[PDB]
Amino acid sequence: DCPSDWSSYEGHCYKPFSEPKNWADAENFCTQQHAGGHLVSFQSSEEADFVVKLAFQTFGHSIFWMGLSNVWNQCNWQWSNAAMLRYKAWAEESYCVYFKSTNNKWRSRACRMMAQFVCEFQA
Amino acid sequence: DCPSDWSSYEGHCYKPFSEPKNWADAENFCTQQHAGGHLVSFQSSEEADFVVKLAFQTFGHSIFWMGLSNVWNQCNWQWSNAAMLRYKAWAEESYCVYFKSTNNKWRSRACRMMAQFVCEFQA
Amino acid sequence: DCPSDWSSYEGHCYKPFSEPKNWADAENFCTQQHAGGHLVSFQSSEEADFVVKLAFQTFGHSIFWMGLSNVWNQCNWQWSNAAMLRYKAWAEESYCVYFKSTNNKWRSRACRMMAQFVCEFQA
Amino acid sequence: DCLSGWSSYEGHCYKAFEKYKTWEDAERVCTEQAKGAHLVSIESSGEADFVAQLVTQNMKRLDFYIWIGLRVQGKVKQCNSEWSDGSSVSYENWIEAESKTCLGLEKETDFRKWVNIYCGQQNPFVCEA
Amino acid sequence: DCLSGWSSYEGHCYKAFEKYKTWEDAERVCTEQAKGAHLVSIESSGEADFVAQLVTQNMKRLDFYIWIGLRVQGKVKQCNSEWSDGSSVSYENWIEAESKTCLGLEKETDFRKWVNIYCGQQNPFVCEA
Amino acid sequence: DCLSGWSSYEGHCYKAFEKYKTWEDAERVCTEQAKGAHLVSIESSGEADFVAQLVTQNMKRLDFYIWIGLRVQGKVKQCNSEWSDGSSVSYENWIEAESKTCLGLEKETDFRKWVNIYCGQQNPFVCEA
Ligand SMILES: [Ca+2]
Ligand SMILES: [Ca+2]
Ligand SMILES: [Ca+2]
Ligand SMILES: [Ca+2]
Ligand SMILES: [Ca+2]
Ligand SMILES: [Ca+2]
């Protein structure tokens, strides 16, 4: 059951937002937007397609954050020469996932950067 | 003749709309927006330049439908081994033509997809 | 000490505008805005990230003009056979530089084309 | 039966290749490779399942499009000769890569549906004899 | 005479090649074809018409750019010394592909106008001897 | 000591190659240089700057990323297993080029910082032995 401004798809409420924010802020914003509020999670291709067209219908051609962050930070980074990774020199701290409203394809963008977003909750 | 909001070019009226619709719906919306109303049809590069400029001036950086659809449905699809085409599992029914307000190059997209558009009518 | 609604970065005032104009007109517009007013100029990656961010936060996903024009007009154009460059048949007279609010990469676009823009001035 | 590498299915032999080639060249490889072999022809749903199972089972990077042998015969950009307002399509300004007249399978659609893609892409493929 | 396959026009020989090479390569192939041959140098409207003519009549695929011999000599991102505010350009962050310092012909302008494109593109070409 | 054309730095030899190879192909060229050679491993600040200096002093074009020996082990598009809502990441639809799990150096950062790039890119590199 969706508060008249949030849209419904399979028992969930979704809503796109205009003000560009970094990933962190956007995630935290969604939480304060509703009980159980979070940045959009795609559990299927059909949910993805719903959100994408919703986003386009609401704010046109732009880019929006999904609820996936620090994507590679926890991976197993190894120097091919088996040297211990001690010294670090990362240009960008961590990458987050976003989608462009033209399709449901997943793309990465540095989390500190701006993008619009879609929040969702269960109710 | 061009009413309020419609722009004239060579005895034709054009007007960009921002409500995202799929191809079928965009075309129909154009038809009931004025007699002879249709989806913009490009018949020269200057005409395309005009429309593209119009589209960017009015709505900025986005994607817009053009009056061409089911682009390859009537094509001669043949198997390389000359097998008989009977079974078919296209993931997508049809593809329609759209332009990006960035340039006047034609691009293809699944007709059921969301996109903004420009209607056009003569005289 | 930037005017009402202009942003500040390292003693400079910056402001993105929504009305699309070609390069020349956007540059003139910027001059008529304040003394020492011109189309934005990048001197470092920091300033670039600042402006790209401002542009995104203000107008979303779009393309904006930089204060660099006629990029190749004064270059040494030569025919590989050393023929005299008497006859001309250029499609477009000059190319100008712009960025896309998704990042700080430099791109080129014919100067007669529309694009949004960011003005910059000092003090 | 078949040759080493090629799997049998209802009187035919198939083999997935992880050489990233262009449609014209993928077809080329298949012809060089066996008894009048070609890019796979999906002629039934059973075969559709077979090829999908084959692709996933024998392949490393399942994050690309995989070529099948169906494409538009004849160099045409679009086949619809008319605009919605009855005019004849004369002037065209297609981005050559925007003419997706070749077909391939992809992960999203469980390697069972055919998606339109530009023939110039470089993708893995499946051959059939 | 001219070489076989080369059409003459005002005391020079021309030939369209449907190979897809980068500007630098296309220029090399042209040199190898005949003594003193290079990419076409259009010095007059009539020559512009001839080359356009030859292209549309002798080319199988006309949806790409066909290289001509006019380009910027060497490593040049931009030749403008400074920004509109008077400050010199030091820091630059170009996209390699955005430096369109080579010129080619296209169908949209009926192969009669010179369009700026990235030199690393692979397109057909017309040689002149 | 070092072979002809290789620069020494704290007991190791380095050589910049201006070949455009993918990460795996670049690593392969290093491995073919010597039993023990691989792509460069930046393990301290002084080494970071030596390499940075090597690149700017030896490469004729600083317009690309130069590959270094750091990358993700495995065939994982991302290592975060849960969405911010708690859900597990089962379904995914990554563009293969968006998984930037290989690193390189670039002019924007003076070849001192490591950038996340798609392993399938063709970039020049430095080998260390
Ligand atoms: Ca969900
Ligand atoms: Ca028309
Ligand atoms: Ca500045
Ligand atoms: Ca078959
Ligand atoms: Ca000549
Ligand atoms: Ca080391």
From Swiss-Prot, chains A, B, C:
Specify the taxonomic lineage.
Eukaryota, Metazoa, Chordata, Craniata, Vertebrata
Residues bound to Ca(2+): S41, Q43, E47, E120
Entry function: When linked to subunit A of IX/X-bp, anticoagulant protein which binds to the gamma-carboxyglutamic acid-domain regions of factors IX (F9) and factor X (10) in the presence of calcium with a 1 to 1 stoichiometry.
What is the top-level taxon of the source organism? Eukaryota
Q: List the disulfide bonds.
A: C2-C13, C30-C119, C96-C111
Give one GO molecular function term: toxin activity
Q: What else is known?
A: Calcium is required for ligand binding.
* GO CC annotations, alphabetized: extracellular region
What is the protein's quaternary organization? Heterodimer with subunit A of IX/X-bp or IX-bp; disulfide-linked.
Query: How would you summarize where this protein is expressed among tissues?
Result: Expressed by the venom gland.
Main localization of the protein described in the UniProt heading: secreted
| The C-type lectin domain, residue ranges | 1-123
Annotated protein name in UniProt: Snaclec coagulation factor IX/factor X-binding protein subunit B
Q: Which family does it belong to?
A: Belongs to the snaclec family.
Q: Which UniProt keywords apply?
A: Blood coagulation cascade inhibiting toxin, Calcium, Disulfide bond, Hemostasis impairing toxin, Metal-binding, Secreted, Signal, Toxin
Curated annotation (Swiss-Prot), chains D, E, F:
The C-type lectin domain is annotated at 1-129
Gene Ontology CC terms, in alphabetical order: extracellular region
Primary localization class, coarse: secreted
Keywords, alphabetical: Blood coagulation cascade inhibiting toxin, Calcium, Disulfide bond, Hemostasis impairing toxin, Metal-binding, Secreted, Signal, Toxin
Which GO MF term does the entry hold, naming one?
A: toxin activity
Report if keyword Calcium is assigned.
Answer: yes
Question: According to its UniProt record, in which tissues is this protein expressed?
Answer: Expressed by the venom gland.
What extra comment accompanies this record?
Answer: Calcium is required for ligand binding.
Q: What does this protein do?
A: Anticoagulant protein which binds to the gamma-carboxyglutamic acid-domain regions of factors IX (F9) and factor X (F10) in the presence of calcium with a 1 to 1 stoichiometry.
Quaternary structure and partners = Heterodimer of subunits A and B; disulfide-linked.
Name it. Snaclec coagulation factor IX/factor X-binding protein subunit A
What organism does the UniProt record list as the source?
Protobothrops flavoviridis
